[PDB]
């Protein structure tokens, strides 16, 4: 399990890569094998992208660390976030082609500049 | 959608190959001799893994992947059989250059980030069968 | 099966078992099997039990037996009237008072020891519990 100290440190790591990151993408992680997920983790370390699946009420505490607070309603449902620490984009262009490749899950809401991007307009990134 | 580990230029004995993927609708001799035509390049005596992909029409496509961590560690330490008592009884040796060759072969075959991750997974299979890394 | 090598006298008075135990504490092992109830332990009982907890530990750690069957019990056989002397010596026993420590143990995981002691106590006539050695 996870002690309160565990959760505290992890909130500090998500808040710490969130401050350092240029852009983020929140998505549904449900209904996909660990094979295709390690495939998007290779396509992740190759694109500079930091991949995570983190607790929701943990990510309200980490995203209270600004300026991703427009995403706190995007945390209802299973949360997989892609932070591109190197480049903006390359998460939002990789996820739409991974979700069209799999035809599972969603890829719900993005965040850039301090604002949230609705699901059909993430083609901006 | 089946997998086997088949010796280098070899195929079509009854107990190892024919029944296993032959109850799945696969033509046996095309797999056998296109796999000996592909893996003619693998050294004699090494089992090489082959992933057979079967479709509703019985026409199959197989990816022959690089020889196992355990087989490239049998050959890079010089040995034949590894340990029956691993890290208690130790049966051979490989310098870090062979860990890195086997982990370039398996850099084609791993999930690893760096050749240090693939060298460390070949490190793990190096501690599994007893072999010493020197 | 324990029994005194040689004795001063061959037979004994039935005696009583009264009052409480000495050696209430675990002086050797980390754990011990203490007796809550009061009763006589034949050598057979002690042996069977020691066996049980010897199977249980797969011959690891160590086992002490703190009790000894030093007092001889007699029985006249069947179909024999009263008198004509005292009966012949049948077997040996150890008098047990509440709070004695029958076996000690260590060099083993606690969980396993509670187990082995349950299995040991299955073979014993008297109420028993598990205990840990303490500082002071």
């Amino acid at each position: 399990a996870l002690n309160l100290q565990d959760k505290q440190a992890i909130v500090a790591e998500v808040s710490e890569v969130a401050k350092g990151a240029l852009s983020a993408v929140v998505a549904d992680s449900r209904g996909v094998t660990v094979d295709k997920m390690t495939e998007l983790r290779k396509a992740g370390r190759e694109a500079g992208v930091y991949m995570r699946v983190v607790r929701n009420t943990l990510l309200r505490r980490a995203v209270e660390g600004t300026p991703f607070e427009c995403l706190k309603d995007a945390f209802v449902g299973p949360t997989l976030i892609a932070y591109s620490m190197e480049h903006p984009g390359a998460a939002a262009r990789l996820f739409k082609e991974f979700a069209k490749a799999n035809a599972k899950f969603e890829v719900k809401a993005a965040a850039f500049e301090g604002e949230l991007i609705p699901a059909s307009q993430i083609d901006r990134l | 959608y089946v997998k086997l580990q088949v010796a280098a230029g070899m195929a079509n004995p009854s107990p190892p190959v024919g029944p296993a993927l032959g109850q799945q609708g696969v033509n046996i001799m095309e797999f056998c001799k296109a796999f000996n035509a592909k893996t003619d390049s693998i050294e004699k005596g090494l089992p090489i893994p082959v992933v057979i992909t079967v479709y509703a029409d019985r026409s199959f496509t197989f990816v022959t992947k690089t020889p196992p961590a355990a087989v490239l560690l049998k050959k890079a330490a010089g040995i034949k059989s590894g340990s029956g008592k691993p890290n208690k009884d130790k049966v051979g040796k490989i310098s870090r250059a062979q860990l890195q060759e086997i982990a370039q072969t398996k850099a084609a075959d791993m999930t690893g980030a760096d050749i240090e991750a693939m060298t460390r997974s070949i490190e793990g299979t190096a501690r599994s069968m007893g072999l010493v890394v020197e | 099966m324990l029994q005194p090598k040689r004795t001063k006298f061959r037979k004994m008075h039935k005696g009583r078992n009264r009052g409480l135990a000495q050696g209430t504490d675990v002086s050797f092992g980390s754990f011990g099997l203490k007796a809550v109830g009061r009763g006589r332990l034949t050598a057979r009982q002690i042996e069977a039990a020691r066996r049980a907890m010897t199977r249980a530990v797969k011959r690891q750690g160590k086992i002490w037996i703190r009790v000894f069957p030093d007092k001889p019990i007699t029985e006249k056989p069947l179909a024999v009237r009263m008198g004509k002397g005292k009966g012949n010596v049948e077997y040996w026993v150890a008098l047990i008072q509440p709070g004695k420590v029958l076996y000690e143990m260590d060099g083993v995981p606690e969980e396993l020891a509670r187990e082995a002691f349950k299995l040991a106590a299955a073979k014993l006539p008297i109420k028993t519990t598990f205990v840990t050695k303490t500082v002071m």
Partner: protein
């Protein structure tokens, strides 16, 4: 740090002690040093859960008696034979 609350014993002997033990309280003593001995009573539970730590035996604790602390160590302790209980504690002035 361990702080034990206590009262001065107005009675003595076997009878007093066994009424003490029936009430879920138990007798102990404080001696050593220039002073006279001080016999006191304690709550069985508090102390039973307190000596459920090891340091209790290696350390300087305090005892609150009629507004007044004393600083002491654990000297020896007699336990009931089969029960998870404490018959008594020798406290030596620290």
């Amino acid at each position: 740090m361990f702080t034990i609350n206590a009262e001065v014993r107005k009675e003595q002997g076997k009878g007093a002690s066994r009424r003490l033990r029936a009430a879920n309280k138990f007798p102990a003593i404080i001696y050593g040093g220039k002073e006279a001995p001080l016999a006191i009573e304690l709550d069985h539970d508090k102390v039973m859960n307190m000596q459920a730590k090891a340091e209790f035996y290696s350390e300087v604790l305090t005892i609150v008696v009629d507004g007044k602390e004393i600083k002491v160590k654990a000297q020896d302790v007699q336990r009931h034979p089969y029960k998870p209980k404490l018959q008594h504690i020798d406290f030596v002035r620290a």
